[PDB]
């Protein structure tokens, strides 16, 4: 399938014999599913997100079918706000990010998909993140008015400054839209801008 990013990339998965809905998430190292019974043995782990750390149950070598594509790998079970398929399984199903329908660069998911952006006349490194609704950039003194906002993910919520109509060049591709500024651990390019550069998930 080729999946565009105007809506959250939610797909049905099969796991432990049950169906679940989950987000294909290039900005996640790992796969995190809401509390559930998983046949398997587990061990405690902590993982981090936009707003801090949570405790999860780590299950290894779990079969998961993602839109009909098979994977067998680590699945973390815990208090995530949305079920997420991260790179550990996206790589197993041969998922890549592609610009402009595949006419542009292809980015594999073996490592975090970090690319150079230009914003406010400044160059920064940011993660191309299909699991982000918004674009979140580390503290940077952007000019212009703004409005306070809170955005969530693993760990809860952080406060950010919302700036609209900010030009952002991504790997040489021009975009313009809302940028949220605040204490994110990693700079994130989310769907609001990935759609403007024609980025798709492909597998």
């Amino acid at each position: 399938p080729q999946i565009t990013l105007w809506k959250r990339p939610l797909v049905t998965i099969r796991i432990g014999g049950q169906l679940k809905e989950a987000l294909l998430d290039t900005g996640a190292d790992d796969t995190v599913i809401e509390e559930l019974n998983l046949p398997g043995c587990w061990k405690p782990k902590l993982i981090g997100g936009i707003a801090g750390f949570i405790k999860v149950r780590q299950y290894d070598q779990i079969p998961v079918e993602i839109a009909g594509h098979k994977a067998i790998g680590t699945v973390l079970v815990g208090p995530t706000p949305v079920n997420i398929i991260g790179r550990n399984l996206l790589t197993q199903i041969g998922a890549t990010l592609n610009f402009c329908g595949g006419g542009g660069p292809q980015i594999t998911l073996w490592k975090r998909p970090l690319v150079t952006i230009r914003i406010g006349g400044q160059l920064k490194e940011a993660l191309l993140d299909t699991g982000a609704d918004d674009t979140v950039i580390e503290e940077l003194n952007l000019p212009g008015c703004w409005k306070p906002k809170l955005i969530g993910g693993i760990x809860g919520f952080i406060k950010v400054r919302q700036y609209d109509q900010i030009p952002v060049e991504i790997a040489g591709h021009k975009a313009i839209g809302t940028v949220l500024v605040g204490p994110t651990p990693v700079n994130i390019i989310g769907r609001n801008l990935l759609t403007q550069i024609g980025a798709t998930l492909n597998f």
Partner: peptide
């Protein structure tokens, strides 16, 4: 493990 915004 770092894992991404809603």
């Amino acid at each position: 493990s770092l894992n991404x915004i809603x």
